[PDB]
Amino acid sequence: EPAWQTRDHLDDPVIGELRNRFGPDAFTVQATRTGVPVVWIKREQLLEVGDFLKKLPKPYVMLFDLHGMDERLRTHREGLPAADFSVFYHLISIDRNRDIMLKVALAENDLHVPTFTKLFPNANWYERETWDLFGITFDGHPNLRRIMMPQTWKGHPLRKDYPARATEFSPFELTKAKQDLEMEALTFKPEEWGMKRGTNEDFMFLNLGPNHPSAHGAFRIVLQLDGEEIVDCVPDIGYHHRGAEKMGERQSWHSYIPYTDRIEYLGGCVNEMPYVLAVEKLAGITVPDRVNVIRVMLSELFRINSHLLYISTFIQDVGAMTPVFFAFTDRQKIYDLVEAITGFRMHPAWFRIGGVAHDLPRGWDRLLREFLDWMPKRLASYEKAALQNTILKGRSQGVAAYGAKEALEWGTTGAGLRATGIDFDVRKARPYSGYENFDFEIPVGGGVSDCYTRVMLKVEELRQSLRILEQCLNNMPEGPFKADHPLTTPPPKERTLQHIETLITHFLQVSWGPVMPANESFQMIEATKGINSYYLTSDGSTMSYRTRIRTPSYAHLQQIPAAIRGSLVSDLIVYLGSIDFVMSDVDR
Amino acid sequence: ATIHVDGKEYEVNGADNLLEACLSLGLDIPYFCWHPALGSVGACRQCAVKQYQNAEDTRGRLVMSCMTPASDGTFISIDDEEAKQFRESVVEWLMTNHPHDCPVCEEGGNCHLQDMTVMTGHSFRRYRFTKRTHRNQDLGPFISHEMNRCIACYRCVRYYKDYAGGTDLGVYGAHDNVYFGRPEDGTLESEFSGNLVEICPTGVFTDKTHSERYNRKWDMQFAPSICQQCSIGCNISPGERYGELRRIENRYNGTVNHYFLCDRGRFGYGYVNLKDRPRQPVQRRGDDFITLNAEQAMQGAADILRQSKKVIGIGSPRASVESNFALRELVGEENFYTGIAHGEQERLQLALKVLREGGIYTPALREIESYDAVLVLGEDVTQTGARVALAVRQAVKGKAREMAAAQKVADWQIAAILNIGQRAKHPLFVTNVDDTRLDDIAAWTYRAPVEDQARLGFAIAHALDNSAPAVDGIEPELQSKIDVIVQALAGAKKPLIISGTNAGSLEVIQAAANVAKALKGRGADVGITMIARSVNSMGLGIMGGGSLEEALTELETGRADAVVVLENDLHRHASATRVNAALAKAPLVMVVDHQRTAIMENAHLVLSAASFAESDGTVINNEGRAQRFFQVYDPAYYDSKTVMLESWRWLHSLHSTLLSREVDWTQLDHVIDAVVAKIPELAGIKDAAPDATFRIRGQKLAREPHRYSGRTAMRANISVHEPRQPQDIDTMFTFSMEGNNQPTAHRSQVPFAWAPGWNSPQAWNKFQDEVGGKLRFGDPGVRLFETSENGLDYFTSVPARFQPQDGKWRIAPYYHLFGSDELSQRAPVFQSRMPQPYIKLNPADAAKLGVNAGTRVSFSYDGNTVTLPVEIAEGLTAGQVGLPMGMSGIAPVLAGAHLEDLKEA
Amino acid sequence: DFLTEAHLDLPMEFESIGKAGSRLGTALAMAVDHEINMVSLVRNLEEFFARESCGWCTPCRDGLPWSVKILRALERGEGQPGDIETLEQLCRFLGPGKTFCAHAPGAVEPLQSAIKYFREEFEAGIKQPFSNTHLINGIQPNLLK
Ligand code: SF4
Ligand code: SF4
Ligand code: SF4
Ligand code: SF4
Ligand code: FES
Ligand SMILES: [Ca+2]
């Protein structure tokens, strides 16, 4: 049985436990290509099912995702409950290495679900984003305001009847918005943002944004302060919203790949991989081995690039401005190899449905060998220059520390989750893209996630990525760079240029789009900054019916208030430098 | 019937074959040679499914789903491995010889062969040998020929010969050298040869007029419109790119014009793209032609109209219901004049009275194909209402259909039906002044003047019913033919009588009404069809008004010092000298029009109105069905200086500026409400299409496909800043791809057909409830009237026989599909197709005048001597001269007029 | 279908020849000696059958010339791997019920019988490696394995 085969997952023990607890008629099991059991639960039993999953012998401890879907235009809904809208809850059990997708069906008039925040605190921002983009009200939410769009925004953009394209610009709207930007400091009310007891009169309100002098993006944090002590803080995000999901509903399966590049713009091919993997799951494509090793090579190269930039920016935020120049020279070496392979520096747009855009250029191994010889001495130099310095250690150790429980309840993944002592990497637990054929280690922490522990874990991850790159250079199969499937978009170019059936396939795939049959697919990968995921719903057309991108920087920014509570502003700056987030990843 | 496809049970129609039954269920089977309108032949061998004998069976057998009936308890599989392998192999065999031509082929992105190559999953070529090659032929100005792309699916020959009755397209050659085309280079003679570009699943037959300015299907902006070239009202999809009307595709209507248009509607659109059209309002001051915007034109016209003592309005059957009603509201009901002559209006009102008061059910265009005998009186259907002639051909083949059904032969087995019914056909009796294009299938043809055809009709009605008025003076041979017609009509279960206003005689319409009443009195299921002239002739007849002669009399007498002419050239309904004198005497002439007409040289004000591609409105076709047509594109999107509005918008704004001295343009639904509130006869036009607030789950209807391209570069040569998307406040459609065009959307107006995997016109199968039937949620268009409870009385006004008087010549009308409609001659592709302007002469009259064939003769009509070359017409009765109606210099009002001093120049 | 010398002791009935993997037909047998190359004989047969196609239906009309070209390539030793497999697939997909009439099953009967009984003559024509594509400068080919 192939990995893309449609499975109902009725042999999962979670289905049997749910049947024994709630009854055989309490839910509907859906057969998908997501790889996880999809269970449609009634709305009135949602909190009961969540509590039952939370109190399992090997419980589902992390709310991985929570969002909505507009099901009004979905023609192929066979074996599904009648739904105008739906809300899905993706929960991960690390102990079982399993996950379950609960789904709640809502009518068009009764668009309200009970809040999930009493079970999982990340449901705060997840439900705020669901309300902002779909208009679904969550009863019991502490403060259900818009998180992506401004508060004075009419309509909900991810609904099907909302126009995707840009409206006409008016200087009047900009000028009045400048007026509210002017009186926002004067007319600030903490009750709007969920804060309480604002201005006792021992607290002051501090706004860091909107523009920070850093490469992680532009955003605001409002802080309740007693002197230099932070008591309450909520981040103001949505300043980097690009409508990537709404764009996914109006681009074909092939023409959306450059938009998948700019989700985490320090990731590139790392961001391209889960999307093309989920599309290949929809298409029923098993890629050959050379495609797997090429994609692994480019993903590890871009992971090293992102980790180098993150370590450099953390060192610069500490105060040492020297190693960022040398590490950007190293990034220039990586960019030289990436320019040679894909033709571009930062957003290659090189992964394809079924393979990659071109074969590897003649001489890639030379550039890879020079880069692999160049890296370790520079890494040791950066280590001895800044990451073994006592001033950097005093600035970074013990700042914004959290344990395994806090990382599990807030959906923190990547360096922080492994620094809390939990060994969970997608490249080993749920392997993808032929990662089982590479010998590499997963670094883990002692059990407490400091800034320093996360930075050293990222350094060890860079070392392991260098090991993977060495294995890619030494052992590469000789064969096709595209699959032997009719849905490989585009087909190989020489056969397009001299065969007429291949020309027909190329013509209809680049113009109208490749036709993915109606199914739901899900791919979860380990990104450069945590765990990334693409959830793609196809209605049988040439475009995505629903593109849902889960990014870890959302969860990290939501964990920001729970970890910095009771600390200083400089601790907040060091924490922001030690998260490895981009605002495009948060806001997408 | 009960069938089981891939283990899933379905209920289908047992009289259908498995291919159309499974396509109606939403299942996908590739097919080439089968068509819903043409039946099954089993040629392309593409639709192979695996049939099993019973519920438990593992071997099966590859059967042909188009050739296999969907009987009760059938077991088939589509996704069987052997069936899929064979379908991919059939695609591969078709692709062995196919040219590497998709980038330079006009069927690219619209190709059924491309769709089925992709859908079978064939993308790898292992064939390494040569590909066969064919030379091409010149098929005329409309169809472009490329025989290399043929897959030998035999659709073209089957449609063109068996369905459309054409004789000049066939299949030649042998084993793999089969050639589909004409026996020699020449124009395709059929009036329905344009449907080959949709019948052909490949790019062998392509729209050449579209090919001149070619763009792909995904790049088109489509709208659901009504063809404006005669009164049949065929549903069309005009598609636009870069501010010009690019193509007319057939839009499916299961009640009117299901899969097929005629060549006048498909290739006569080129007047929209003419460069001499008015794009701005123009005011004539002395010798200068100054250009205004909309507001100053409205203010100036309102001021001058307010100073006038009486403003009259001359409508037209070209304009929609809303434009005519807005003109009627602006000038007043008693000052509104229909733009047609007195005789044309009298014939139109009589045909309307017969239709909506005669008690006989008038059929739709699809319903015509089920009648058992057809009598066409006076009307040249193929040149005036061509789609009715096609439906008459199908009704004639109905006898072979019945003969094959009597032998338990399935109705989709077209070859067996044609073999059983060899040459037996339902009776067709056509009367005209000469031979018609229906004569190859007609049981009898009567070449006689209009009075003699009316007398023949009155005699048929008297022989059917003795209470009908009798005709004295019938020859014994003509009486024998009369009783042959009467015996054929009386034995028919469903007789159909077709007449119209194009014969130029009231008595022909009266005789057809008498025949229909006599057949109704015998208990027969008689239907009556009346063919009008223009797109909204029925609408102008229902709304009514004075004739053009009364308007010219008011202008000449000085009682009217202001005339507003709406979408009328005024020369097809009256003499040019009289119109020019009356318009020159008027101190204000104001022409609201979208085509540069000859009456704008004396016009004081010209309003740049919109054509059907740039306007919304309602038109009433010949059967009395109200149909809404929608705007295709915004003319001001590309050229921002273009101020071209709807005619009803112009006239409503003029009425508002005349009354309240303020400008209000309108919304379209406001004008629709005004029409249905003030004219109860036109109250049914509200249900023709839903209002502008109609949504499909909250979103509008997309005009263009979702892969519409060039949004940030197509206007970049003017300005790099992208403009506002045009807002359509009038209708429910949006000028963007941000809309709904789902096949399952609860709507009736479909701008274009597209399904994922079905890019060709075969996506209409996805847009129908059953394949070849109606649309899923009904067809657009609502009949304005029901059939009457009681009929009329017999028309006792029997005319005398035609007497050829000396020194005078009766003008026999000759109509052409290319040349008689006013707007179609303006299309520059038609001048290569329109015939040379002739004059038809009987051999005895030509010998009496000493003129041969081809010599020039000069005749004076209304004191205007024009010369034409002589063509000898054998079937024309003596004492008559035949003139081509609607051409240059020959108005259609000249039908039945007398001609003086016809003499060789 | 071609029959070997082992089938020579069989009565000339419909059932007996039908049970041997052939047909009685017109019962006018034709004898092939050792001097006749089976590939050339089957090429002559298929050339007749391809040029006497009526052109109505796709498998015979567009698949018999493919078999003709394959057998012509095998005649001069220009056959490539996949040719005999293509001939066998053509024999399976031009059987009874797959074409509009019974001309193409009779066309592919000698080809499948000669491939069954004399495969060593068809394998002798496959000399050149398979090449459907030529090199295009600047585009690296997709080297399928
Ligand atoms: S007819 Fe179809 S397959 Fe052939 S060249 Fe044209 S678009 Fe391509
Ligand atoms: S010309 Fe077109 S319609 Fe005619 S047989 Fe060939 S592919 Fe079919
Ligand atoms: S029959 Fe009349 S309405 Fe129909 S396509 Fe022809 S001209 Fe247009
Ligand atoms: S199998 Fe028969 S029907 Fe088909 S093309 Fe060959 S000879 Fe004609
Ligand atoms: S569609 Fe049935 S054989 Fe052609
Ligand atoms: Ca409009």
DSSP string of A221-258? Answer: EEEEEETTEEEEEEEE--TT---HHHHHTSSBTTTTHH
* Alpha helices in B679-772, H assignment, sequence order: none
Q: Which of A478, A492, A498 lies at the smallest CB-CB distance from C142?
A: A492
- Please report where in the chains the tokens 């692994």 appear, as a residue: A296
AA letter at A95: D
How many residues can be counted in chain A?
Answer: 588
Query: Do the Cβ atoms of B44 and C57 come within 8 Å?
Result: yes
Closest CA to B92 of A501, A486, C56, C90: A501
Pairing of β B373-377 and β B428-432: parallel
- Specify which residues B377 forms β-bridges with: B431
Question: What are the E-state strand segments in A107-242?
Answer: 112-114, 137-139, 204-207, 220-226, 229-236
The answer to whether the Cα torsion of B741, B742, B747, B749 is positive or negative is positive
CA angle B366, B372, B373 (to 5 degrees): 105
AA letter at B205: F
Nearest 5°: phi and psi at B7?
85, 0
Distance B147 CA to ligand 4 centre (A): 21
CB proximity C81 to B under 8 Å: no
B849 close to B843: Cβ distance less than 8 angstroms:
no
Task: Output the CA torsion B678→B681→B687→B689 (10° steps).
Answer: -80
Q: Residue B341, class by beta-carbon neighbours within 10 Å (0-12 exposed, 13-18 middle, 19+ buried)?
A: buried
Query: Do the Cβ atoms of C143 and A484 come within 8 Å?
Result: no
- Nearest atom, ligand 4, residue C52 CA: 7
Q: Which of B46, B86, B175 lies at the smallest CB-CB distance from C55?
A: B175
Nearest 5°: phi and psi at B367?
-70, -15
Dump the DSSP string for B451-507: HHHHHHHHHHHHHH-TTSPP-----HHHHHHHHHHHHHHHT-SSEEEEEEGGG--HH
- Specify which residues B40 forms β-bridges with: B413
Cα A125 from Cα A552, distance rounded (Å): 13
Q: How many CB atoms lie within 10 A of CB B704?
A: 28
Distance A346 CA to ligand 1 centre (A): 38
Which tokens go with C16?
Answer: 């007996």
Closest CA to B482 of B463, B468, B467: B463
A88 close to A126: Cβ distance less than 8 angstroms:
no
Cα C66 from Cα C70, distance rounded (Å): 6
How many residues can be counted in chain B?
Answer: 905
Domain span holding position C61: 38-124
Which tokens go with C47?
Answer: 């050339």
* Alpha helices in B154-280, H assignment, sequence order: 155-157, 196-199, 208-212, 263-267
C-beta pairs of A96-100 under 8 Å, 24+ apart in sequence: A96/A14, A96/A58, A96/A60, A97/A429, A97/A430, A98/A12, A98/A14, A98/A36, A98/A60, A99/A36, A99/A60, A99/A64, A100/A12, A100/A14, A100/A36, A100/A37, A100/A38, A100/A39, A100/A53, A100/A60
Cα B409 from Cα C58, distance rounded (Å): 25
Closest CA to A402 of A557, A568, A562, A233: A562
Resolution (A): 2.9
> CATH number for the A13-139 domain, one of 3.30.1330.40, 3.30.460.80, 3.90.76.10, 3.40.50.720?
3.30.460.80
B629 close to B306: Cβ distance less than 8 angstroms:
no
Cα C111 from Cα C86, distance rounded (Å): 12
Q: Check if CATH label 3.30.420.10 holds for domain A244-587.
A: no
C-beta pairs of C69-76 under 8 Å, 24+ apart in sequence: C69/B129, C71/C39, C71/C42, C71/C43, C71/C46, C72/C43, C73/C125, C74/C39, C74/C43, C74/C122, C74/C125, C74/C126, C75/C37, C75/C39, C75/C40, C75/C43, C75/C125, C76/C125
Cα B397 from Cα B403, distance rounded (Å): 10
Which tokens go with B295?
Answer: 């507001």
The enclosing H or E element of B880 equals strand B880-884
* Residues whose CB is less than 8 angstroms from the CB of residue A245 and which lie 6 or more positions away in sequence, other chains included: A133, A158, A546, A547, A548, A549, A588
Helix (H/G/I), strand (E/B), else coil: A326: helix
B466 close to B896: Cβ distance less than 8 angstroms:
no
Q: What is the largest CA-CA distance in chain C?
A: 66
Cα Rg of chain A, angstroms: 24
Query: For A368-393, b where at least 16 C-beta lie within 10 A, e where not — what string?
Result: beebeeebeebbeebeeebbebeebe
Helix (H/G/I), strand (E/B), else coil: B121: coil
Helix (H/G/I), strand (E/B), else coil: A533: strand
B818 close to B824: Cβ distance less than 8 angstroms:
yes
> In a mutagenesis test of the A interface, which of C131, C142, C143 is the best target, namely the one with the most A β-carbons within 10 Å?
C142
Q: Ligand 4, from C49, C60, C90, C108: best to mutate by most atoms within 8 Å of Cβ?
A: C60
The answer to whether the Cα torsion of B207, B209, B210, B214 is positive or negative is positive
Q: What is the largest CA-CA distance in chain A?
A: 80
Which tokens go with B831?
Answer: 């001048």
Cα A518 from Cα A543, distance rounded (Å): 11
Cα B434 from Cα B641, distance rounded (Å): 51
* Residues whose CB is less than 8 angstroms from the CB of residue A29 and which lie 6 or more positions away in sequence, other chains included: A8, A9, A10, A15, A37, A38, A39, A40
Dump the DSSP string for C73-114: HHHTT-B-TTHHHHHHHHHHHTSTTTSSSTHHHHHHHHHHHH
- Specify which residues B207 forms β-bridges with: B143
Q: How many CB atoms lie within 10 A of CB B458?
A: 27
Q: Residue A575, class by beta-carbon neighbours within 10 Å (0-12 exposed, 13-18 middle, 19+ buried)?
A: buried
Cα A515 from Cα B118, distance rounded (Å): 9
Q: How far is A40 from chain B (nearest CA, A)?
A: 23
Q: How far is A513 from chain C (nearest CA, A)?
A: 22
Residues of C in contact with B125 (CB under 8 A): 132
CATH number where C81 lies: 1.20.1440.230
Which tokens go with A62?
Answer: 């992390």
Closest CA to B132 of C108, C50, C101, C75: C50
Q: What is the largest CA-CA distance in chain B?
A: 91
The experimental technique behind this entry is: cryo-EM
CB proximity B777 to C under 8 Å: no
Residues of B in contact with A498 (CB under 8 A): 100
- HSE at residue A199, side-chain half, CA atoms within 13 A, is 8
CA distances (Å), A198 to each of A190, A225, B350, in order? 6, 10, 85
Pairing of β B428-432 and β B444-447: parallel
Dump the DSSP string for A276-325: HHHHHHHHT----HHHHHHHHHHHHHHHHHHHHHHHHHHHHHHT--SHHH
Chain C 114-133, residues with CB within 8 Å of chain A CB atoms: 132-133
CB proximity A25 to C under 8 Å: no
Q: Which of B48, B174, B176 lies at the smallest CB-CB distance from C65?
A: B176
Domain boundaries, chain A: 13-139, 244-587
Chain Cα centroid distance, residue A324:
26
CA distances (Å), A300 to each of A267, A295, B450, in order? 10, 9, 89
Ligand 5 contact, B46 CB (< 6 A): yes
Question: What are the E-state strand segments in B68-154?
Answer: 74-77, 143-145
Question: What are the E-state strand segments in A42-97?
Answer: 62-70, 85-93
Query: Do the Cβ atoms of A165 and B725 come within 8 Å?
Result: yes
**CATH code for the part of the protein at B808-904:** 2.40.40.20
